Amino acid sequence: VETISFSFSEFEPGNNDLTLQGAAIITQSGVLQLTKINQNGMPAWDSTGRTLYTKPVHIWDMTTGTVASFETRFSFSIEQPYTRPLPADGLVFFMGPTKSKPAQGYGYLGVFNNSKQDNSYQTLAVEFDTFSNPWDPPQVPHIGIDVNSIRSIKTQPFQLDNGQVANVVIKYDASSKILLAVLVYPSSGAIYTIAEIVDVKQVLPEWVDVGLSGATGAQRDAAETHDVYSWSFHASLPE
Amino acid sequence: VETISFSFSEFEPGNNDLTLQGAAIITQSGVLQLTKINQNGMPAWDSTGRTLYTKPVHIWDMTTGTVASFETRFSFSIEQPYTRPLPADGLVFFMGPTKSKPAQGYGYLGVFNNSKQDNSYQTLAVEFDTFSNPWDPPQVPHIGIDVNSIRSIKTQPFQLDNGQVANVVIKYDASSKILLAVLVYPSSGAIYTIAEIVDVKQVLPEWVDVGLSGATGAQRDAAETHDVYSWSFHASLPE
Ligand SMILES: [Ca+2]
Ligand SMILES: [Ca+2]
Ligand SMILES: [Mn+2]
Ligand SMILES: [Mn+2]
Numbered sequence: 395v396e397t398i399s400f401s402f403s404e405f406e407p408g409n410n411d412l413t414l415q416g417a418a419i420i421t422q423s424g425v426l427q428l429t430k431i432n433q434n435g436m437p438a439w440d441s442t443g444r445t446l447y448t449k450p451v452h453i454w455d456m457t458t459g460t461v462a463s464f465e466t467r468f469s470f471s472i473e474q475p476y477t478r479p480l481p482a483d484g485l486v487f488f489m490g491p492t493k494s495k496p497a498q499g500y501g502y503l504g505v506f507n508n509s510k511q512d513n514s515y516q517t518l519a520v521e522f523d524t525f526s527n528p529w530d531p532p533q534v535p536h537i538g539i540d541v542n543s544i545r546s547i548k549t550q551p552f553q554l555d556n557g558q559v560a561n562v563v564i565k566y567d568a569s570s571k572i573l574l575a576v577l578v579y580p581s582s583g584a585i586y587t588i589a590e591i592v593d594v595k596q597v598l599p600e601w602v603d604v605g606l607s608g609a610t611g612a613q614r615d616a617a618e619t620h621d622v623y624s625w626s627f628h629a630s631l632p633e
Numbered sequence: 634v635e636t637i638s639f640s641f642s643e644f645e646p647g648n649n650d651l652t653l654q655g656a657a658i659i660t661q662s663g664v665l666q667l668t669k670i671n672q673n674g675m676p677a678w679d680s681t682g683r684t685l686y687t688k689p690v691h692i693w694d695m696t697t698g699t700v701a702s703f704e705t706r707f708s709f710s711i712e713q714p715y716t717r718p719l720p721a722d723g724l725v726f727f728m729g730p731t732k733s734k735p736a737q738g739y740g741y742l743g744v745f746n747n748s749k750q751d752n753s754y755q756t757l758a759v760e761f762d763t764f765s766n767p768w769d770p771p772q773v774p775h776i777g778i779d780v781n782s783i784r785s786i787k788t789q790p791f792q793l794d795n796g797q798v799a800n801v802v803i804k805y806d807a808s809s810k811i812l813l814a815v816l817v818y819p820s821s822g823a824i825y826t827i828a829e830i831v832d833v834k835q836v837l838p839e840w841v842d843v844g845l846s847g848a849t850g851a852q853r854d855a856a857e858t859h860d861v862y863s864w865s866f867h868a869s870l871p872e
Contacts, residue, residue: 467824563824572828576815580822585706585802589811589828 396452396462399628411448416496416504418443418608428485428608428620436475437617439610442499446605450492451629453602454595461568461595462631466604472524472535473557473619482525482611484535485620487564490517492603501527502544504607511543516599518592520564520575521546524554524618525611537575539590541597550588555579559623566594635691635701638867650687655735655743657682657847665861667724667847675714676849676856681738683846684861689731691870692841693834700807700834703868705843711763711774712796712858721764721850723774724859726803729756731842740766741783743846750782755838757831759803759814760785763793763857764850776814778829780836789827794818798862807833807871 400411404424414420417430417438429441454461466487474481486503496504505519509529519540526534529545535554538546558581566573574589604627608620639650643663653659656669656677669680693700705726713720725742735743744758748768758779765773768784774793777785797820805812813828843866847859 561822561824563826565826565828567828570828570830572811572830574811574813574826574828576824576826578817578822578824580819583800583817583819585800585815585817587802587804587813587815589804589806589809589813591809591811 395633396631397629398449398451399626400447401626403624405622413446413448414443415446416443417441418445426622428606428622429610429617431619437473437610437619439615439617440499440612441610441617442496442504442608444496444504444605444607446494446603447627450601450603452600452631453489453598453629454600455631456600458633460632462629463566463568464627464629465563465565466625466627467563468606468622468625469559469561470622471557471559471619472554474524474554475618476615479611479613479616480525481618482616483609484521484523484525485606485608486519486521486540487606488517488519489598489602489604490515491599492601494603496607499609500612501525502609504609506544509544511545513542515542516597517542518573518594518597522577537577537586537588539573539575539588539592541592548588548590550586552577552586553584555581555584558582566592568594634872635870636868637688637690639686640865642863644861652685652687653682654685655682656680657684667845667859667861668849668856670858676712676858678849678853678856679738679851680856681735681743681846681848683735683743683844685842685844686866689840689842690868691839692728692837692868693839694870695839697872699871701868701870702805702807703866704802704804705864705866706800706802707845707864708798708800708862710796710798710858710860710862711793713763713793714857715854718850718852718855719764720857721855722848723760723762723764724845724847725758725760726801726845727756727758728837728841728843729754730838731840733842735846738848739851740764742848745783748783750780750784752781754781755836756781757812757833757836761816776816776825776827778812778814778827778831780831787827787829789825791816791825792823794820794823805831805833
């Protein structure tokens with residue numbers, strides 16, 4: 395069995411096990427700010443940032459046909475400072491081709507480049523979407539499972555507890571092909587769940603990079619914070 | 634669309650929407666004690682109790698072939714007073730034939746009668762097992778998905794936070810056939826998940842009763858509390 399795992403109780407500036415991209419920044423206090431926070435302490439619009447675990451994950455083996463099961467956990471906070479314009483756009487956990495570069499920002503969360511379902515993306519993602527784009531359900535924010543597209547194969551609305559820390563748990567069981575996500579707000583006790591069938595073997599390449607990405611809006615002040623406090627990951631590939 | 638739903642933010646003695654069976658009683662304080670609490674304030678062994686919702690639920694329709702999606706949530710607490718003998722046995726949420734009475738207690742949790750996988754049980758359930766019987770995984774407590782058998786088709790160990798309140802969320806999406814269960818301990822922030830594929834049409838009858846059940850051990854002082862503070866349920870049958 396081939397296994398890989400990491401756990402950051404807090405983010406460490408300078409730890410090479412994590413690559414920062416775009417506006418992404420790790421504060422001295424240990425917080426990962428995916429989208430730029432201005433001098434005045436407020437989230438900047440037109441911003442996109444990501445972080446990738448430096449080491450690639452062996453998610454499945456073509457020769458043997460085996461597929462790994464995995465789980466990732468992280469705590470994050472989103473603070474929407476203005477009543478208008480609407481806030482945007484969200485953050486997301488993603489898995490895809492190794493050594494990828496940030497894609498289009500805004501509603502594409504830095505992971506996609508358009509709103510088409512393309513197998514060439516070879517990406518699987520769990521989003522926490524804050525702005526309703528033409529391809530989105532009307533309810534916002536919402537959790538969404540993305541398979542080779544920003545257009546979720548399934549979504550689940552949830553209420554944002556402004557500035558409060560949300561605990562997220564994502565798990566994929568290769569035998570049942572079930573990918574599930576759970577979001578918990580310890581502040582209010584609220585619990586949300588979403589799940590769907592996903593055959594990673596039909597989506598992702600054998601080796602992938604796992605990461606987090608966030609993006610703020612296209613017009614002035616259509617922004618919000620996309621801070622992450624901790625991130626753990628584990629994958630087990632049977633032989 | 635055929636929909637049904639109920640929500641007890643608390644329990645009240647006398648409310649006839651809930652049928653109490655065996656040792657289960659609703660205290661003046663509004664707490665549902667599935668298993669007998671003696672006069673000295675401790676849990677009695679050799680006790681089995683359950684509560685059923687008075688009205689049946691239309692889970693699926695043979696003629697049209699339509700299948701209902703549902704979700705249920707509840708809060709419970711288990712207190713294990715002694716170091717020895719081991720505590721036992723657990724509580725569980727179940728869906729099965731209407732007009733049912735409590736089955737065997739102990740490790741069968743008042744829902745099954747043996748350790749066989751019999752289609753005649755026509756029962757689906759999510760247990761929170763505190764004792765490890767011969768058919769169980771070695772770790773207890775554990776969550777488990779039961780399909781016509783006390784021998785779970787899938788289990789998930791978890792740590793008990795003694796006497797603390799656990800928040801449970803169980804959801805079933807018929808289109809994906811996914812059955813998910815989540816447990817959250819507000820006290821510690823701990824989150825546990827478990828999911829599996831279940832085709833209710835191959836398991837349950839068209840109409841079912843939904844309920845909760847708890848049981849204590851077969852030997853003196855092999856017991857624990859099985860209190861439920863709240864319970865909600867909702868189902869929706871397409872067309
Ligand atoms: Ca969006
Ligand atoms: Ca047991
Ligand atoms: Mn979306
Ligand atoms: Mn068990």
